[PDB]
Write a protein that binds this ligand. Structure first.
Ligand SMILES: CC(C)N(c1ccc(Oc2ccccc2)cc1C(=O)O)C(=O)[C@H]1CC[C@H](C)CC1
Ligand SMILES: [Mg+2]
Length: 559
């Protein structure tokens, strides 16, 4: 069937949409070519709609069924709990889209009589009505990028706040613990960036002759079929579940996840969906399970040998035992055909990679640098173009989510996050006298509130003290960063070094936590290095819930 059907009504915005970067005195010091920076708007929605709309092809074989049963057996060990309204509400982000039933984010978290009473009625309804298609709103997502030698906005389909709270009640526990139980070490969201690298590097070394590749599925969400979603429900159903939760999953599956009507911001019937919705609680879990299933089965059809998968939603990377250049290329092609039959055709054709640093998964790649002692140290990085374009935009305008803070946390050891983002933002935060202020950001889709002053500890716990001393990066990483700077018009190292030394001095004079950031974060900038000993606060940090599972589109907030 058709991934989508359209009525003609347009996907409309719900206010004014900024497309260009504001000429700002502060954004200009970070990036000079402001015209290369842009944000998607509903004005490009038509272009997107045509790309995600198509008839899906699907043929299932014995390999698929086999892997499916393997997966179900493991799911069979699971015991999901079911959250009470109270907890599900606690999980709602303070700034999440309001409900059309008289209440909003704040009321939900505050457990207002009106919000809880409505939520209750939606839950009862999910228990009584097993059919009626649940209404969703479709919107053009606004995201920032740098022009290329432009991207049309992405679309998001999400149900009402009321319905979202119920999804949590019935599936929060499931989507937080079933992926790991079913896929084990292949589930990428259980790893912190450093743990992801270690898993990738060790996996790579465990091969006599390693061969690896990333697989890009062309619009993965639209390739998800009604069948894949029921197969996915079948996996969830192997769990021990409270009666009400079992019915909630059954009804939410037929009424929401397999598809339903599309309404715009004006309240107009836009069309219908018969593929994955991007703004539902099961999206990450669902996509990860389905990609792993098709991929694993695809590997068997292709005869790839000793495959180790690493899956994060629709993002996939496979590392296996080489069989030779020609044989690897043939196997890879066979893999792609198997995936195509399973309704997961490629966007970018896949290519075998014999160099670990050249494999990009989760928009990132593993690379290597050196610590003070001089020992090689592997770490996660990525092309900084987008991270930087967005740092510029968030500098010029107020945004709910600060990706820059999220990028500093996840890529702390990188040459670009240290030299550019830390310097730029600590300089700016000192000025505005807002170093104490907590900011929201996302990690694997879950929303968190973090104090910039804590970055030193956070970085030590997740990356180790070496994140403050890495130097001598790879020639490949250096060219990528440098050619990035030229493109966006970012000041060179010298300028940044001067700024960092000036910010570092200012941070050291304040003492307390600010001096902590001064000493650690900017030690790369001075010549007279300061001995960097373990930060006490790093040994008393609970950062486990940070890397448990994916939540993108889940409307998840970790208090
Ligand atoms: C060796 C030495 C001088 N050096 C480098 C300076 C420039 C560079 O590569 C470029 C080139 C152009 C633009 C940006 C970086 C790479 C390195 C390195 O450590 O290998 C450093 O000490 C870095 C160490 C990390 C900080 C955070 C910035 C300076
Ligand atoms: Mg893709």
């Amino acid at each position: 069937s058709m991934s989508y059907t359209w009525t003609g009504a347009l996907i409309t915005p719900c206010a004014a949409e900024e497309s260009k970067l504001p000429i700002n005195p502060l954004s200009n010091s970070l990036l000079r070519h402001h015209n290369m920076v842009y944000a998607t708007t509903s004005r490009s929605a038509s272009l997107r709609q045509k790309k995600v709309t198509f008839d899906r092809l699907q043929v299932l074989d014995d390999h698929y069924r086999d892997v499916l049963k393997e997966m179900k057996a493991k799911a069979s060990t699971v015991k999901a709990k079911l959250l009470s309204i109270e907890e599900a509400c606690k999980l709602t982000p303070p700034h999440s889209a309001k409900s059309k039933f008289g209440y909003g984010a704040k009321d939900v978290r505050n457990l207002s009589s009106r919000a809880v009473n409505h939520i209750r009625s939606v839950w009862e309804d999910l228990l009584e009505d097993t059919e009626t298609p649940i209404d969703t709103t479709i919107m053009a997502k606004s995201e920032v990028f740098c022009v290329q030698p432009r991207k049309p906005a992405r679309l998001i389909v999400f149900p009402d706040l009321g319905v979202r709270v119920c999804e949590k009640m019935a599936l929060y526990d499931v989507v937080s613990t079933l992926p790991q139980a079913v896929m084990g070490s292949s589930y990428g969201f259980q790893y912190s960036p450093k743990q992801r690298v270690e898993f990738l590097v060790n996996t790579w070394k465990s091969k006599k002759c390693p061969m690896g590749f990333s697989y890009d599925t062309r619009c993965f969400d639209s390739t998800v079929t009604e069948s894949d979603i029921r197969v996915e429900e079948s996996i969830y159903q192997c769990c021990d579940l409270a009666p009400e939760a079992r019915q909630a999953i059954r009804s939410l599956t037929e009424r929401l996840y397999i598809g339903g009507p599309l309404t715009n911001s004006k309240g107009q019937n836009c069309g219908y969906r018969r593929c994955r919705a991007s703004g539902v609680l099961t999206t990450s879990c669902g996509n990860t399970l389905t990609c792993y299933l098709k991929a694993t089965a695809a590997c068997r059809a292709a005869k790839l040998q000793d495959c180790t998968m690493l899956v994060n939603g629709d993002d996939l990377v496979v590392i296996c035992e080489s069989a030779g250049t020609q044989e690897d290329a043939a196997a890879l092609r066979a893999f792609t055909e198997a995936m195509t039959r399973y309704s997961a055709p490629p966007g970018d054709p896949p290519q075998p990679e014999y160099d670990l640093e050249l494999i990009t998964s989760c928009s990132s790649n593993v690379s290597v640098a050196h610590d003070a002692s001089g020992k090689r140290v592997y770490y996660l990085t990525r092309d900084p173009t987008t991270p930087l374009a967005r740092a510029a935009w968030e500098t010029a305008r107020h945004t709910p989510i600060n990706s820059w803070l999220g990028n500093i946390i996840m890529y702390a050891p990188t040459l670009w996050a240290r030299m550019i983002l830390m310097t730029h933002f600590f300089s700016i935060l000192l000025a505005q006298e807002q170093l104490e202020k907590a900011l929201d950001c996302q990690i694997y889709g879950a929303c968190y509130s973090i104090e910039p002053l804590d970055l030193p500890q956070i970085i030590e716990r997740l990356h180790g003290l070496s994140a403050f001393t890495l130097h001598s990066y790879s020639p490949g990483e250096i060219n990528r960063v440098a050619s990035c700077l030229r493109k966006l018009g970012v000041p060179p190292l010298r300028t940044w070094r001067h700024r960092a030394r000036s910010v570092r001095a200012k941070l050291l004079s304040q003492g307390g936590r600010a001096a902590t950031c001064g000493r650690y974060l900017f030690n790369w900038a001075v010549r007279t290095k300061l001995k960097l000993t373990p930060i006490p606060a790093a040994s008393q940090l609970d950062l486990s819930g940070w890397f448990v599972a994916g939540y993108s589109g889940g409307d998840i907030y970790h208090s």
